[PDB]
Amino acid sequence: AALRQPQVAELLAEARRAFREEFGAEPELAVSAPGRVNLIGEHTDYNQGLVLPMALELMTVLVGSPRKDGLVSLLTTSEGADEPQRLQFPLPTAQRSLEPGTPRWANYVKGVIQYYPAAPLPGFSAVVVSSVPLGGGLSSSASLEVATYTFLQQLCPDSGTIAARAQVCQQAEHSFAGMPCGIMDQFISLMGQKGHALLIDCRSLETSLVPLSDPKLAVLITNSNVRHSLASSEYPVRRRQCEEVARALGAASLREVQLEELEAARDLVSKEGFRRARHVVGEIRRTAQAAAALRRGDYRAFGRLMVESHRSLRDDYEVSCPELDQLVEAALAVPGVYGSRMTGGGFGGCTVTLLEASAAPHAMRHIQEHYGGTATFYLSQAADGAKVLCL
Ligand SMILES: O=C1CCCC2=C1C1(CCCCC1)N=C(Nc1nc3ccccc3o1)N2
Ligand SMILES: OC[C@H]1O[C@@H](O)[C@H](O)[C@@H](O)[C@H]1O
Protein backbone atom coordinates (compact mmCIF):
# COMPACT_ATOMS: atom_id res chain seq x y z
CA ALA A 1 0.00 0.00 0.00
CA ALA A 2 0.91 3.67 0.28
CA LEU A 3 1.47 3.34 4.07
CA ARG A 4 5.05 4.24 5.03
CA GLN A 5 6.12 2.57 8.28
CA PRO A 6 8.54 4.46 10.60
CA GLN A 7 11.38 1.87 10.61
CA VAL A 8 13.03 3.65 13.55
CA ALA A 9 15.50 0.92 14.55
CA GLU A 10 16.54 0.64 10.88
CA LEU A 11 17.19 4.40 10.53
CA LEU A 12 19.60 4.34 13.47
CA ALA A 13 21.30 1.19 12.16
CA GLU A 14 21.66 2.81 8.72
CA ALA A 15 23.24 5.89 10.28
CA ARG A 16 25.72 3.82 12.32
CA ARG A 17 26.86 1.69 9.36
CA ALA A 18 27.32 4.74 7.12
CA PHE A 19 29.33 6.51 9.83
CA ARG A 20 31.74 3.57 10.31
CA GLU A 21 32.22 3.18 6.54
CA GLU A 22 32.65 6.96 6.05
CA PHE A 23 34.94 7.86 8.96
CA GLY A 24 36.67 4.56 9.73
CA ALA A 25 35.44 4.21 13.34
CA GLU A 26 32.25 3.76 15.39
CA PRO A 27 30.32 6.97 16.30
CA GLU A 28 30.34 7.96 19.98
CA LEU A 29 26.74 9.21 20.11
CA ALA A 30 23.30 9.29 18.53
CA VAL A 31 20.57 11.94 18.72
CA SER A 32 17.16 12.26 17.10
CA ALA A 33 14.52 14.96 16.73
CA PRO A 34 11.08 14.29 15.15
CA GLY A 35 9.04 15.93 12.46
CA ARG A 36 5.56 17.07 13.41
CA VAL A 37 1.91 17.37 12.39
CA ASN A 38 -0.07 20.43 13.52
CA LEU A 39 -3.50 19.23 14.66
CA ILE A 40 -4.93 22.77 14.55
CA GLY A 41 -3.76 26.37 14.97
CA GLU A 42 -2.40 27.18 11.52
CA HIS A 43 -0.61 30.45 10.74
CA THR A 44 -1.04 31.51 14.38
CA ASP A 45 2.48 30.99 15.81
CA TYR A 46 4.00 34.14 14.25
CA ASN A 47 0.89 36.05 15.42
CA GLN A 48 1.67 35.16 19.09
CA GLY A 49 -1.25 32.70 18.90
CA LEU A 50 -1.97 29.12 20.01
CA VAL A 51 -0.89 25.94 18.18
CA LEU A 52 -1.62 22.28 18.91
CA PRO A 53 1.07 20.10 17.22
CA MET A 54 2.20 16.54 17.96
CA ALA A 55 5.60 14.96 17.24
CA LEU A 56 5.84 12.08 14.75
CA GLU A 57 7.86 8.85 14.69
CA LEU A 58 9.32 10.29 11.47
CA MET A 59 12.61 11.77 12.59
CA THR A 60 16.11 12.98 11.76
CA VAL A 61 19.01 11.11 13.40
CA LEU A 62 22.56 12.40 13.80
CA VAL A 63 25.27 9.89 14.73
CA GLY A 64 28.73 11.33 15.32
CA SER A 65 31.91 12.00 17.33
CA PRO A 66 33.85 15.11 18.48
CA ARG A 67 37.06 16.00 16.61
CA LYS A 68 40.28 17.67 17.83
CA ASP A 69 40.89 19.85 14.76
CA GLY A 70 38.05 22.40 14.99
CA LEU A 71 36.43 21.32 11.73
CA VAL A 72 32.97 19.93 10.94
CA SER A 73 32.60 16.96 8.59
CA LEU A 74 29.12 15.84 7.47
CA LEU A 75 27.58 13.11 5.33
CA THR A 76 23.84 12.76 4.66
CA THR A 77 22.32 9.59 3.20
CA SER A 78 18.90 11.19 2.69
CA GLU A 79 17.70 10.46 -0.86
CA GLY A 80 16.22 13.88 -1.64
CA ALA A 81 19.09 15.91 -0.18
CA ASP A 82 20.78 18.16 -2.79
CA GLU A 83 24.33 17.45 -4.05
CA PRO A 84 26.91 17.03 -2.71
CA GLN A 85 25.93 14.63 0.09
CA ARG A 86 29.08 15.68 2.00
CA LEU A 87 30.37 19.00 3.34
CA GLN A 88 33.25 20.07 5.58
CA PHE A 89 33.89 23.50 7.04
CA PRO A 90 35.88 24.97 9.95
CA LEU A 91 33.90 25.99 13.06
CA PRO A 92 32.90 29.70 12.93
CA THR A 93 35.16 32.09 14.84
CA ALA A 94 34.99 35.78 15.79
CA GLN A 95 37.20 36.17 12.70
CA ARG A 96 35.06 34.09 10.29
CA SER A 97 31.30 33.31 10.39
CA LEU A 98 29.63 30.47 8.47
CA GLU A 99 27.55 31.52 5.45
CA PRO A 100 24.57 29.78 3.75
CA GLY A 101 25.11 28.22 0.32
CA THR A 102 25.50 24.80 -1.32
CA PRO A 103 24.31 22.26 -0.55
CA ARG A 104 21.03 23.57 0.99
CA TRP A 105 20.63 20.70 3.48
CA ALA A 106 23.87 21.72 5.20
CA ASN A 107 22.58 25.28 5.76
CA TYR A 108 20.35 24.00 8.58
CA VAL A 109 23.33 22.47 10.39
CA LYS A 110 25.57 25.49 9.75
CA GLY A 111 22.87 27.86 10.99
CA VAL A 112 22.47 26.03 14.31
CA ILE A 113 26.27 25.88 14.77
CA GLN A 114 26.56 29.61 13.97
CA TYR A 115 24.01 30.64 16.62
CA TYR A 116 24.83 27.94 19.21
CA PRO A 117 24.97 29.86 22.55
CA ALA A 118 27.63 27.95 24.51
CA ALA A 119 31.44 27.51 24.29
CA PRO A 120 33.80 25.89 23.70
CA LEU A 121 32.20 23.99 20.82
CA PRO A 122 34.64 21.37 19.38
CA GLY A 123 34.55 20.18 15.77
CA PHE A 124 32.79 16.91 14.96
CA SER A 125 32.10 14.22 12.37
CA ALA A 126 28.45 13.25 11.79
CA VAL A 127 26.09 11.28 9.55
CA VAL A 128 22.58 12.72 9.08
CA VAL A 129 19.64 10.48 8.12
CA SER A 130 15.90 11.25 8.13
CA SER A 131 12.56 9.50 7.62
CA VAL A 132 10.81 12.88 7.49
CA PRO A 133 9.81 13.43 3.79
CA LEU A 134 12.08 16.33 2.78
CA GLY A 135 10.02 19.47 2.15
CA GLY A 136 6.82 17.39 2.47
CA GLY A 137 5.18 19.60 5.13
CA LEU A 138 6.08 17.69 8.32
CA SER A 139 8.96 19.99 9.35
CA SER A 140 11.97 18.06 8.04
CA SER A 141 14.11 21.18 8.49
CA ALA A 142 13.12 21.79 12.12
CA SER A 143 13.86 18.14 12.86
CA LEU A 144 17.35 18.61 11.38
CA GLU A 145 17.92 21.88 13.26
CA VAL A 146 16.78 20.36 16.56
CA ALA A 147 18.75 17.14 16.02
CA THR A 148 21.81 19.30 15.34
CA TYR A 149 21.15 21.40 18.45
CA THR A 150 20.73 18.23 20.56
CA PHE A 151 24.07 16.92 19.24
CA LEU A 152 25.85 20.20 20.05
CA GLN A 153 24.50 19.98 23.62
CA GLN A 154 26.33 16.66 23.97
CA LEU A 155 29.55 18.29 22.70
CA CYS A 156 29.16 21.41 24.85
CA PRO A 157 26.17 21.59 27.29
CA ASP A 158 24.26 24.85 27.04
CA SER A 159 22.89 26.34 30.20
CA GLY A 160 19.70 27.32 28.57
CA THR A 161 15.94 27.07 28.32
CA ILE A 162 13.77 25.23 25.81
CA ALA A 163 12.55 28.55 24.31
CA ALA A 164 16.15 29.73 23.82
CA ARG A 165 16.95 26.47 22.00
CA ALA A 166 13.86 26.81 19.79
CA GLN A 167 14.88 30.42 19.03
CA VAL A 168 18.36 29.30 17.89
CA CYS A 169 16.89 26.72 15.52
CA GLN A 170 14.35 29.32 14.33
CA GLN A 171 17.15 31.85 13.74
CA ALA A 172 19.01 29.21 11.67
CA GLU A 173 15.82 28.74 9.59
CA HIS A 174 15.47 32.52 9.05
CA SER A 175 19.11 33.41 8.43
CA PHE A 176 20.49 30.31 6.74
CA ALA A 177 17.46 28.99 4.86
CA GLY A 178 15.69 32.31 4.27
CA MET A 179 12.42 31.01 5.76
CA PRO A 180 11.01 33.41 8.44
CA CYS A 181 9.10 30.70 10.32
CA GLY A 182 7.37 31.00 13.67
CA ILE A 183 8.41 29.00 16.71
CA MET A 184 5.99 26.06 16.40
CA ASP A 185 7.99 23.44 14.50
CA GLN A 186 11.19 23.82 16.54
CA PHE A 187 9.19 23.87 19.78
CA ILE A 188 7.38 20.57 19.11
CA SER A 189 10.55 18.88 17.86
CA LEU A 190 12.23 19.75 21.18
CA MET A 191 9.28 19.25 23.53
CA GLY A 192 7.13 16.44 22.10
CA GLN A 193 6.29 13.49 24.35
CA LYS A 194 4.95 10.05 23.40
CA GLY A 195 1.14 9.89 23.76
CA HIS A 196 0.77 13.70 23.96
CA ALA A 197 -0.09 16.68 21.81
CA LEU A 198 1.55 19.98 22.82
CA LEU A 199 -0.54 23.13 23.24
CA ILE A 200 1.85 26.01 22.73
CA ASP A 201 1.05 29.55 23.76
CA CYS A 202 3.26 31.52 21.39
CA ARG A 203 2.77 34.70 23.42
CA SER A 204 3.73 33.50 26.92
CA LEU A 205 5.68 30.42 25.76
CA GLU A 206 3.72 28.34 28.27
CA THR A 207 3.23 24.79 27.01
CA SER A 208 0.80 22.06 28.01
CA LEU A 209 1.28 18.37 27.33
CA VAL A 210 -2.23 17.13 26.51
CA PRO A 211 -2.75 13.30 26.69
CA LEU A 212 -3.64 11.79 23.30
CA SER A 213 -3.62 8.09 24.13
CA ASP A 214 -7.17 6.87 23.36
CA PRO A 215 -6.62 3.81 21.07
CA LYS A 216 -10.06 4.34 19.48
CA LEU A 217 -8.65 7.56 17.97
CA ALA A 218 -6.19 7.80 15.07
CA VAL A 219 -4.30 10.53 13.24
CA LEU A 220 -3.85 9.80 9.51
CA ILE A 221 -1.39 12.03 7.67
CA THR A 222 -1.74 12.18 3.88
CA ASN A 223 1.16 13.48 1.77
CA SER A 224 -0.16 15.11 -1.42
CA ASN A 225 3.36 14.76 -2.86
CA VAL A 226 3.10 18.27 -4.31
CA ARG A 227 4.78 21.56 -3.35
CA HIS A 228 3.67 24.61 -5.36
CA SER A 229 6.02 27.60 -5.85
CA LEU A 230 3.75 29.89 -3.79
CA ALA A 231 4.74 27.80 -0.73
CA SER A 232 8.02 29.70 -0.40
CA SER A 233 7.02 33.11 -1.74
CA GLU A 234 3.58 33.61 -0.13
CA TYR A 235 4.40 32.58 3.48
CA PRO A 236 6.30 35.87 4.17
CA VAL A 237 3.53 37.82 2.36
CA ARG A 238 0.83 36.49 4.76
CA ARG A 239 3.16 37.15 7.68
CA ARG A 240 3.82 40.72 6.36
CA GLN A 241 0.08 41.33 5.99
CA CYS A 242 -0.77 40.20 9.56
CA GLU A 243 1.83 42.68 10.87
CA GLU A 244 0.14 45.55 8.96
CA VAL A 245 -3.25 44.80 10.57
CA ALA A 246 -1.75 44.80 14.07
CA ARG A 247 -0.03 48.11 13.23
CA ALA A 248 -3.27 49.75 12.02
CA LEU A 249 -5.16 48.62 15.15
CA GLY A 250 -2.40 49.59 17.61
CA ALA A 251 -2.10 45.95 18.71
CA ALA A 252 1.32 44.50 19.59
CA SER A 253 0.17 41.31 17.83
CA LEU A 254 -3.09 39.87 16.45
CA ARG A 255 -3.41 37.77 19.61
CA GLU A 256 -4.48 40.91 21.50
CA VAL A 257 -7.15 41.49 18.84
CA GLN A 258 -10.52 39.92 19.56
CA LEU A 259 -12.90 38.95 16.72
CA GLU A 260 -15.58 41.38 17.99
CA GLU A 261 -12.99 44.18 17.81
CA LEU A 262 -11.93 43.13 14.29
CA GLU A 263 -15.40 43.47 12.75
CA ALA A 264 -15.78 46.93 14.30
CA ALA A 265 -12.38 48.34 13.22
CA ARG A 266 -12.54 47.11 9.62
CA ASP A 267 -12.56 50.55 7.99
CA LEU A 268 -9.04 51.06 9.40
CA VAL A 269 -7.67 48.04 7.49
CA SER A 270 -7.71 46.69 3.90
CA LYS A 271 -10.26 44.14 2.63
CA GLU A 272 -7.68 41.39 2.13
CA GLY A 273 -5.89 42.22 5.40
CA PHE A 274 -9.25 41.88 7.19
CA ARG A 275 -9.74 38.37 5.72
CA ARG A 276 -6.20 37.30 6.74
CA ALA A 277 -6.71 38.69 10.27
CA ARG A 278 -10.16 37.07 10.48
CA HIS A 279 -8.52 33.69 9.83
CA VAL A 280 -5.84 34.37 12.49
CA VAL A 281 -7.94 35.81 15.31
CA GLY A 282 -10.57 33.19 14.53
CA GLU A 283 -8.00 30.34 14.47
CA ILE A 284 -6.60 31.30 17.90
CA ARG A 285 -10.11 30.98 19.38
CA ARG A 286 -10.71 27.63 17.63
CA THR A 287 -7.38 26.26 18.90
CA ALA A 288 -8.28 27.11 22.51
CA GLN A 289 -11.67 25.47 21.99
CA ALA A 290 -10.03 22.48 20.28
CA ALA A 291 -7.59 21.90 23.18
CA ALA A 292 -10.51 22.05 25.63
CA ALA A 293 -12.43 19.65 23.38
CA LEU A 294 -9.48 17.22 23.33
CA ARG A 295 -9.37 17.21 27.15
CA ARG A 296 -13.09 16.35 27.34
CA GLY A 297 -12.70 13.72 24.58
CA ASP A 298 -15.16 15.75 22.44
CA TYR A 299 -13.81 14.80 19.02
CA ARG A 300 -16.86 16.03 17.08
CA ALA A 301 -16.22 19.58 18.31
CA PHE A 302 -12.47 19.19 17.66
CA GLY A 303 -13.18 17.84 14.18
CA ARG A 304 -15.75 20.55 13.41
CA LEU A 305 -13.10 23.11 14.39
CA MET A 306 -10.54 21.24 12.19
CA VAL A 307 -12.78 21.24 9.09
CA GLU A 308 -13.54 24.85 10.09
CA SER A 309 -9.75 25.46 10.17
CA HIS A 310 -9.35 24.08 6.63
CA ARG A 311 -12.20 26.23 5.26
CA SER A 312 -10.68 29.33 6.88
CA LEU A 313 -7.23 28.48 5.48
CA ARG A 314 -8.78 27.82 2.03
CA ASP A 315 -11.04 30.89 1.79
CA ASP A 316 -9.71 33.54 4.21
CA TYR A 317 -5.97 32.83 4.37
CA GLU A 318 -5.73 31.30 0.86
CA VAL A 319 -2.89 28.87 1.60
CA SER A 320 -4.60 25.69 0.49
CA CYS A 321 -4.40 24.29 -3.06
CA PRO A 322 -6.66 21.97 -5.18
CA GLU A 323 -4.69 18.89 -4.11
CA LEU A 324 -5.14 19.67 -0.39
CA ASP A 325 -8.80 20.64 -0.87
CA GLN A 326 -9.44 17.36 -2.68
CA LEU A 327 -7.62 15.22 -0.08
CA VAL A 328 -9.79 16.84 2.61
CA GLU A 329 -13.05 16.45 0.65
CA ALA A 330 -12.21 12.75 0.15
CA ALA A 331 -11.45 12.25 3.86
CA LEU A 332 -14.38 14.35 5.07
CA ALA A 333 -16.92 12.19 3.20
CA VAL A 334 -15.91 9.04 5.12
CA PRO A 335 -18.02 8.04 8.18
CA GLY A 336 -15.96 8.09 11.38
CA VAL A 337 -13.76 10.99 10.22
CA TYR A 338 -14.27 13.84 12.70
CA GLY A 339 -12.16 16.38 10.83
CA SER A 340 -9.56 16.74 8.11
CA ARG A 341 -7.54 19.80 7.13
CA MET A 342 -4.28 20.83 5.55
CA THR A 343 -1.43 20.90 8.06
CA GLY A 344 1.66 23.11 8.07
CA GLY A 345 2.32 26.06 5.76
CA GLY A 346 0.08 24.99 2.86
CA PHE A 347 0.34 25.14 -0.96
CA GLY A 348 1.07 21.39 -0.88
CA GLY A 349 2.40 18.94 1.71
CA CYS A 350 0.12 16.93 3.97
CA THR A 351 -3.38 16.82 5.35
CA VAL A 352 -4.19 15.56 8.85
CA THR A 353 -7.34 13.52 9.46
CA LEU A 354 -8.70 12.87 12.97
CA LEU A 355 -10.90 9.78 12.83
CA GLU A 356 -12.10 6.61 14.54
CA ALA A 357 -9.24 4.13 14.32
CA SER A 358 -11.34 1.37 12.72
CA ALA A 359 -12.10 3.67 9.77
CA ALA A 360 -8.43 4.27 8.87
CA PRO A 361 -8.05 1.31 6.39
CA HIS A 362 -11.22 2.49 4.59
CA ALA A 363 -9.41 5.82 4.08
CA MET A 364 -6.26 4.35 2.53
CA ARG A 365 -8.01 2.35 -0.20
CA HIS A 366 -10.40 5.24 -0.90
CA ILE A 367 -7.96 8.16 -0.73
CA GLN A 368 -5.55 6.35 -3.10
CA GLU A 369 -8.40 5.53 -5.53
CA HIS A 370 -10.00 9.01 -5.33
CA TYR A 371 -6.99 11.41 -5.21
CA GLY A 372 -5.71 12.80 -8.53
CA GLY A 373 -2.04 12.60 -7.47
CA THR A 374 0.09 10.07 -5.54
CA ALA A 375 -0.92 9.83 -1.86
CA THR A 376 1.52 8.62 0.80
CA PHE A 377 0.16 7.73 4.25
CA TYR A 378 1.45 7.85 7.81
CA LEU A 379 -0.60 6.39 10.64
CA SER A 380 1.06 8.23 13.44
CA GLN A 381 1.25 7.78 17.18
CA ALA A 382 2.12 10.94 19.14
CA ALA A 383 5.89 10.64 19.60
CA ASP A 384 8.81 11.81 21.76
CA GLY A 385 10.73 14.99 21.04
CA ALA A 386 14.54 15.29 20.95
CA LYS A 387 16.39 12.24 22.38
CA VAL A 388 20.01 11.09 23.01
CA LEU A 389 21.51 7.62 23.01
CA CYS A 390 25.16 7.26 24.05
CA LEU A 391 26.91 4.68 21.87
O1 LIG B 1 14.28 22.68 -0.76
C1 LIG B 1 13.55 22.75 0.20
C2 LIG B 1 12.31 23.64 0.23
C3 LIG B 1 12.08 24.26 1.62
C4 LIG B 1 11.89 23.19 2.70
C5 LIG B 1 13.06 22.18 2.65
C6 LIG B 1 13.88 21.93 1.42
C7 LIG B 1 15.06 20.92 1.36
C8 LIG B 1 16.47 21.53 1.65
C9 LIG B 1 17.76 20.80 1.25
C10 LIG B 1 17.58 19.47 0.54
C11 LIG B 1 16.35 19.46 -0.36
C12 LIG B 1 15.03 19.74 0.37
N1 LIG B 1 15.25 20.27 2.69
C13 LIG B 1 14.38 20.53 3.82
N2 LIG B 1 14.52 19.88 5.08
C14 LIG B 1 15.51 18.91 5.25
N3 LIG B 1 16.58 18.59 4.49
C15 LIG B 1 17.21 17.51 5.14
C16 LIG B 1 18.38 16.74 4.85
C17 LIG B 1 18.74 15.72 5.73
C18 LIG B 1 18.03 15.45 6.91
C19 LIG B 1 16.89 16.20 7.21
C20 LIG B 1 16.52 17.23 6.31
O2 LIG B 1 15.44 18.09 6.33
N4 LIG B 1 13.33 21.45 3.80
O1 LIG C 1 0.91 27.02 10.71
C1 LIG C 1 1.86 27.56 9.76
C2 LIG C 1 3.26 26.99 10.04
O2 LIG C 1 4.04 26.98 8.85
C3 LIG C 1 5.15 26.20 9.27
O3 LIG C 1 5.50 25.22 8.32
C4 LIG C 1 6.20 27.14 9.85
O4 LIG C 1 7.46 26.49 9.96
C5 LIG C 1 5.56 27.36 11.23
O5 LIG C 1 6.30 28.37 11.95
C6 LIG C 1 4.07 27.78 11.08
O6 LIG C 1 4.02 29.18 10.72
Side-chain angles (χ1 to χ4, degrees), residues 37-42 52 217-221 279 283 286-287 289-291 293 298-299 301-303 305-314 328 331-332 337-343 351-355:
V37 68
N38 190 17
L39 298 177
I40 202 250
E42 220 72 77
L52 187 56
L217 179 70
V219 176
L220 172 72
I221 302 167
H279 163 73
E283 183 77 351
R286 299 122 93 193
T287 302
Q289 296 180 182
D298 187 8
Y299 305 138
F302 192 100
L305 294 168
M306 276 181 84
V307 171
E308 240 188 73
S309 163
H310 190 252
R311 172 145 33 213
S312 181
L313 286 164
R314 183 183 59 198
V328 163
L332 234 183
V337 164
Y338 296 104
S340 196
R341 57 185 291 276
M342 54 161 279
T343 196
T351 65
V352 58
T353 316
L354 190 74
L355 67 0

Side-chain angles (χ1 to χ4, degrees), residues 36 38 41-46 51 137 139 173 179-186 235 344-346:
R36 71 95 183 86
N38 190 17
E42 220 72 77
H43 291 273
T44 51
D45 61 347
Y46 53 80
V51 298
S139 305
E173 180 100 69
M179 174 40 65
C181 64
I183 65 73
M184 168 174 44
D185 306 341
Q186 292 76 16
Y235 180 99

Side-chain angles (χ1 to χ4, degrees), residues 47 50 53 58 64 116 158-159 163 183 203 207 270 336 373:
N47 290 301
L50 298 173
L58 309 177
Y116 191 69
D158 74 5
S159 279
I183 65 73
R203 176 173 53 190
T207 61
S270 130

